[PDB]
Paper text:
Two host-guest collagen peptides (GPP)4-(GXY)4-(GPP)3, where (GXY)4 sequences are from the α1 and α2 chains of human type I collagen, were recombinantly linked to chains A, B and C (corresponding to α1, α2 and α3 in collagen nomenclature and omitted here to avoid confusion) of the NC2 domain in the following combinations designated as α1Aα1Bα1C (for short 111), α1Aα1Bα2C (112), α1Aα2Bα1C (121), α2Aα1Bα1C (211) and α2Aα2Bα2C (222). The most important observation is that the triple-helical chain stagger is entirely determined by the NC2 domain.
All five constructs were screened for crystallization, but only three of them yielded crystals of sufficient quality, crystal structures for 111, 211 and 121 were independently solved using the MAD phasing from selenomethionine derivatives (thereafter designated as 111sm, 211sm and 121sm) to 2.25 Å, 2.10 Å and 1.6 Å, respectively. Whereas the crystal packing for 111sm and 211sm are similar (two trimers per asymmetric unit), it differs from that for 121nat or 121sm (one trimer per asymmetric unit). The most deviated pair is the first trimer (chains A, B, C in the asymmetric unit) of 121sm versus the second trimer (chains D, E, F) of 111sm (r.m.s.d. of 3.01 Å). Most of deviations observed for overall superimposition of trimers are attributed to distal flexibility of the triple helical fragments caused by crystal packing.
Residue numbers in the entry:
A (entry chain C): 1 to 67
B (entry chain B): 2 to 61
C (entry chain A): 2 to 67
């Protein structure tokens, strides 16, 4: 009379691809900046030469004044 | 003499999907700390040196 | 005595893939800004402070009792 059920169907389609990965970790902090350069002795002498000389001269005159 | 059979049982499930794509590369790290500022000591040392030099030059 | 049935329908889709791997770590940050160097004006200010702070030594070098 009535027929056997057919053979099993074809395998299903492969599943959907997984979700994208999470973003990577941030990098480490950069190295410290270089130290500030110190002024040379010649530069300091040039800038302060007259100042020191004037201060000494004024003081010298003041301390050897007569009343 | 009879009617044909039913459609067969549904097929087996498909394989697992391939793994997800790799994530975005991480951002660059923060900038490093600022370098040390030049202290006043190197200026003090020279200023003291000049003071002694010029005071001695008044002594002579 | 009846003919066999047609083959069944396509099966289920598979389970979704596992999540992707985390991305590469980022590169190191840039180096910090340099330390500041003294200006000409700052140098003069320091020098004037030193003169004031050692004004006593200066006076002593030029004038003492007797």
């Amino acid at each position: 009379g009535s027929g056997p059920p057919g053979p099993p169907g074809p395998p299903g389609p492969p599943g959907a691809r997984g979700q994208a990965g999470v973003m990577g970790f941030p990098g480490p902090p950069g190295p410290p900046g270089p130290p500030g350069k110190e002024a040379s002795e010649q530069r300091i002498r040039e800038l302060c030469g007259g100042m020191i000389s004037e201060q000494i001269a004024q003081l010298a005159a003041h301390l050897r004044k007569p009343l | 003499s009879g009617p044909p059979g039913p459609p067969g049982p549904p097929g087996p499930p498909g394989a697992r999907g391939q793994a997800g794509v790799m994530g975005f590369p991480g951002p660059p790290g923060p900038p490093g700390p600022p370098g040390r500022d030049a202290t006043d000591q190197h200026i003090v040392d020279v200023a003291l040196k000049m003071l002694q030099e010029q005071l001695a030059e008044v002594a002579v | 005595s009846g003919p066999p049935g047609p083959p069944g329908p396509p099966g289920p889709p598979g389970a979704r893939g596992q999540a992707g791997v985390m991305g590469f770590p980022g590169p190191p940050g840039p180096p910090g800004p340099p330390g500041r160097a003294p200006t000409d004006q700052h140098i003069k200010q320091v020098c004037m402070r030193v003169i004031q702070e050692h004004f006593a030594e200066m006076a002593a070098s030029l004038k003492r009792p007797d």
